[PDB]
Amino acid sequence: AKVCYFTGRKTSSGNNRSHAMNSTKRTVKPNLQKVRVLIDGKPKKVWVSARALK
Amino acid sequence: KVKEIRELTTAEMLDKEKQLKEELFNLRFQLATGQLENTARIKEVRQSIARIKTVLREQAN
């Protein structure tokens, strides 16, 4: 779960914000699933985003 | 004195190289046992060997 093969969606950072405006660090991730695709003949199991399969 | 080393062939080159290396062996044995009045001849032989080797490199491209 590191990138996607066709787009580039990867992980980044964000903030939590809790009702008094305190801020801590945080991780944001893309929605990656392992799929078999035909990239030059032989199938491969790669991580692909659900937005590029849509 | 390369003007003479350029008056020879690549066989007599290797021959004089053998001769001068042997001279160095004998000089080195003189200097240790208390002989060799003329110590400036050790440098001269080193430099004649150097000259033969450069000239042989130059001619074989």
């Binding site: - | 290396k21 080195r28 200097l31 240790a32």
Partner: protein, 89 residues
Amino acid sequence: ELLDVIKRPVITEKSMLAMDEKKYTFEVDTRANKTLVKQAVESAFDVKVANVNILNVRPKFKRMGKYAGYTKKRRKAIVTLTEDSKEIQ
């Protein structure tokens, strides 16, 4: 290279006694074999050799003028003959 291998003879009081049993001491090259020295000696004098022995010598701290540092390393080989002789002086 058979003519850069032997450097020179050793002439000390422990080495004069060896010349009376047919043994000769030379400072030889570092990176030389027992066998390579044997070949070189048989080539440069036309003798027949029994038994090279070989040693390494450590450098010595010296200190001349408020500047200190070591002498060279050394290799010493002692060559025994069957029957023949070399005349060094």
